[PDB]
């Protein structure tokens, strides 16, 4: 089932800044008190 | 001409050469990761101490 969707608002897509997100951790081990 | 279809047909046949005969070929890949494992061995467990 597909219907079309003509009632879209054109507009330019806006940008922000990302800051400091996106930090994720990268690996399934565990650390403490440590600079990785 | 110009445009060959990939797809090609095996002649496989009970009387072929040693080396164009089938062989099933299964690869399995190996991966380590701190999670947990759950493909172990026959190995049996103890109690801990």
Not at chain 1, 8 to 36: C, M
Not at chain 2, 30 to 46: D, W
């Amino acid at each position: 089932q597909c219907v079309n969707l003509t009632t879209r608002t054109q507009l330019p897509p806006a940008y922000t800044n990302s800051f400091t997100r996106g930090v994720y951790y990268p690996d399934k081990v565990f650390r403490s008190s440590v600079l990785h | 001409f110009n445009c060959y279809f990939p797809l090609r047909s095996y002649s496989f046949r009970p009387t072929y050469g040693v080396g164009h005969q089938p062989y099933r070929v299964v690869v399995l890949s190996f991966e380590l990761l701190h999670a947990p494992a759950t493909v172990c061995g026959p190995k049996k467990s103890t109690n801990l101490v």
